Amino acid sequence: TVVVTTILESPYVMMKKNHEMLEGNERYEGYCVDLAAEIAKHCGFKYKLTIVGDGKYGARDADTKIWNGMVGELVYGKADIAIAPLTITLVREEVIDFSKPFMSLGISIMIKKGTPIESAEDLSKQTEIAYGTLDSGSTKEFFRRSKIAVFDKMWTYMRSAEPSVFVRTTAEGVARVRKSKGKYAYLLESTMNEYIEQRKPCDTMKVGGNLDSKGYGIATPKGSSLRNAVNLAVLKLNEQGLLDKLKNKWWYDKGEC
Amino acid sequence: TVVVTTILESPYVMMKKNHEMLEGNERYEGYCVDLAAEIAKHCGFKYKLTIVGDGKYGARDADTKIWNGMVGELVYGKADIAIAPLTITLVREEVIDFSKPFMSLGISIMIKKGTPIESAEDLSKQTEIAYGTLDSGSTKEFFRRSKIAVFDKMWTYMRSAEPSVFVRTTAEGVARVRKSKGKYAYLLESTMNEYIEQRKPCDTMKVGGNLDSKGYGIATPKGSSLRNAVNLAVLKLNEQGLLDKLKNKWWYDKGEC
Numbered sequence A, B: 001t002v003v004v005t006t007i008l009e010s011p012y013v014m015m016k017k018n019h020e021m022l023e024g025n026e027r028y029e030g031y032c033v034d035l036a037a038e039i040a041k042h043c044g045f046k047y048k049l050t051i052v053g054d055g056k057y058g059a060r061d062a063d064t065k066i067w068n069g070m071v072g073e074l075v076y077g078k079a080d081i082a083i084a085p086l087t088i089t090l091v092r093e094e095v096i097d098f099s100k101p102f103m104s105l106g107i108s109i110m111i112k113k114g115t116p117i118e119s120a121e122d123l124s125k126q127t128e129i130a131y132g133t134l135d136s137g138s139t140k141e142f143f144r145r146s147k148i149a150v151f152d153k154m155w156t157y158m159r160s161a162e163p164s165v166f167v168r169t170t171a172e173g174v175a176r177v178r179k180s181k182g183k184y185a186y187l188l189e190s191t192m193n194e195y196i197e198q199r200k201p202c203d204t205m206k207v208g209g210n211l212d213s214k215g216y217g218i219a220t221p222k223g224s225s226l227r228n229a230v231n232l233a234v235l236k237l238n239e240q241g242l243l244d245k246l247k248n249k250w251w252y253d254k255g256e257c
């Protein structure tokens, strides 16, 4: 039996209605639960979904350099595979292997509905509507590193803005959009932006296209005999249109707006 | 010296001004020529750019099942690496290894400027403006396979439309957009759509977002000692913002519109 590490994060993995009367894999539902079943079928293995204990994606501890989260479970021999919204990054690809992306996503703009902003270009040209990101992590780093004129202009504004336009958590950012009288836009991953747009209270929306491109991938420990089959499975599901349909199911078919 | 197979395709690889008085790698310029230099630097190797003889990307011959194009050069031991706009596909991943994408792209709508169409949804609801794709290949297959309502509606229309909405070549599709009095929209890869939008006669444009997601990757033969280093190089260049800047250079800085 393959031990699959994953994470409780809507709509990827969620506790099912009446989970306390269910057992094993049947306790969970969501996009990644459906994806795990498809991968397992195509690769021909039995598996056990296990929620990562610390509830983390995976980063090196600053002090010890030990990996936490799902990446930790893989690199220290506790799980055979991670099927989760785990971003393909350099720091992680150095220590585990990723499949090709099963979901693409990018940095995107969230506004309260009514806010007179339709593009990053619009945001960049004005200051009455403040805008920012998580105070650490890849979204902030994108702007800090960008040589594209519009994003460089945005970074110049954000890094100097007072009061701070940076937030500690997604919840804080989204709350700030909702309660600041149209004076705050939040920059975050498109998947989460799109998900929140389809939940009550139905008062936010994504504007503009994605500002960059990255992907979520399935991760296996170095030397795994599953690496190849998992990669080919992902490309097959993509090309067959199954992953598009699955995204539509969990974002829109199950939507509230 | 690493033999790099590539393909003459603007703006990825083009003959330089005065190439006849230059030699070796100096004969060529473009996005992939710049990318090859960056990869080589980061991986620490010397290299020779070689244009694929048949001018093809890579497909199995129907009769012999022998691979042509750049994929052929890799699988039959003629080149060490392919640095080109080569799409990451299942059929290819079975026989060569791809880096993570160095460029993302998707199916997109091309119209003549003035055409009253702003989305796939718009196109799908009407028939006065015809629309189609290349008569074979991945774009047609996307629509044929899609379970998404809007794309299924589009496929139902396109497959039955008379006269045929399918074309043999990109040039034919683009010409059809330009000369059919606003009665034809062409569905193609976003990178090419974006490129043509920035060339004279400056009369076409991309409308709507991308309809799907795929990627171009660097390809290495199975068992290559370059596989890992090349993959990490691509992720580094992406995260540093170099690939965004490079795309901006060759599409927009060198643009004509």
Ligand SMILES: CNC(=O)c1cn(-c2cc3c(=O)n(NS(C)(=O)=O)c(=O)[nH]c3cc2C(F)(F)F)cn1
Binding pocket: A009, A057, A058, A085, A086, A087, A088, A089, A137, A138, A169, A170, A171, A189, A191, A192
């Ligand atoms: C209650 N959930 C949240 O607040 C939340 C979760 N996410 C989220 C974060 C990550 C993530 O941090 N990483 N690590 S990283 C920054 O790329 O190095 C991931 O790999 N994936 C994530 C996925 C999510 C998601 F799916 F919940 F949006 C974003 N907001």
Ligand SMILES: CNC(=O)c1cn(-c2cc3c(=O)n(NS(C)(=O)=O)c(=O)[nH]c3cc2C(F)(F)F)cn1
Binding pocket: B009, B057, B058, B085, B086, B087, B088, B089, B137, B138, B169, B170, B171, B189, B191, B192
């Ligand atoms: C003169 N050039 C053209 O007509 C042209 C070239 N392209 C193009 C095609 C491909 C391609 O066919 N494949 N094989 S595939 C269909 O994905 O199995 C690729 O891998 N990459 C391509 C890239 C281009 C590009 F870059 F020129 F747009 C699209 N139109």
